[PDB]
């Protein structure tokens, strides 16, 4: 189904299942009609790959996301957290949060009444909340190009319903369900980065 696992009480997110779940997200970018999204997809997919690579060297040692941060802090010393899977996940979480905010905004019925069949307001909001603070104007220009090329809302919701024979209402209900464990998970990852002093503010 690709619903994320429920958050456990102890909030320790298992790495493997996490990676398996988020790996289903990049394919949704393909359904969009442009190479102009390939930068945002590639980034998320690239960071997933980096984390999986570290995890696969020792799944036991890296069983949870917290384990990754703990182990790599120990391993890399003062270079940490600008290293390894910690750094990849630092960026991944921002792309995941973008998706979260974008989907939640759409589900919540946020829109520009002048352009109700566009998703520019939702993408902008998501971009400003998740990614913009971490991008210089070169990269922001790359992201605007994807904004202006965003699909129509109706076409976007069609792309998500490629399951199928589903109204836009029903589609949105499925998205709201996905958002529950997804949001919780991303929030927990953010909370972890802050707690572990793993968050960096440098721009790319
Ligand atoms: C019900 C699961 C829906 C998952 C949708 C992921 C959408 C990616 C967002 C985007 O392409 O800009
Ligand atoms: Cl419109």
From Swiss-Prot:
Q: Which GO biological process categories is it annotated with?
A: ceramide transport; intermembrane lipid transfer
What are the subcellular locations of this protein?
Cytoplasm
Q: Which PANTHER family match?
A: GLYCOLIPID TRANSFER PROTEIN, GLYCOLIPID TRANSFER PROTEIN-RELATED
What is the protein name given in its UniProt record?
A: Glycolipid transfer protein
What this protein is reported to do is described as: Accelerates the intermembrane transfer of various glycolipids. Catalyzes the transfer of various glycosphingolipids between membranes but does not catalyze the transfer of phospholipids. May be involved in the intracellular translocation of glucosylceramides.
Q: Has the keyword Magnesium been applied to this entry?
A: no
Which Pfam families does the UniProt entry name for this protein? GLTP
**The protein's assembly and partners:** Monomer.
Q: Give GO MF terms, alphabetically.
A: ceramide 1-phosphate binding; ceramide 1-phosphate transfer activity; glycolipid binding; lipid binding; lipid transfer activity
Give the residue ranges for region: 2 X 12 AA approximate tandem repeats: 40-61
Membership in a protein family: Belongs to the GLTP family.
Q: Mind telling me which Gene3D superfamilies this protein's record contains?
A: Glycolipid transfer protein (1.10.3520.10)
Q: Which residues does the record give as beta-D-galactosyl-(1->4)-beta-D-glucosyl-(1<->1)-N-[(9Z)-octadecenoyl]-sphing-4-enine binding sites?
A: 43-50, 135, 202
Where, in residue numbers, are the sequence repeats?
40-50, 51-61
What keywords tag this UniProt record?
Acetylation, Cytoplasm, Lipid transport, Repeat, Transport
Native source organism of the sequence: Bos taurus
GO cellular component entries: cytosol
Write down the InterPro entries for this protein, in alphabetical order: GLTP_sf (IPR036497), Glycolipid_transfer_prot_dom (IPR014830)
Tissue-level expression: Detected in brain, kidney, spleen, lung, cerebellum, liver and heart.
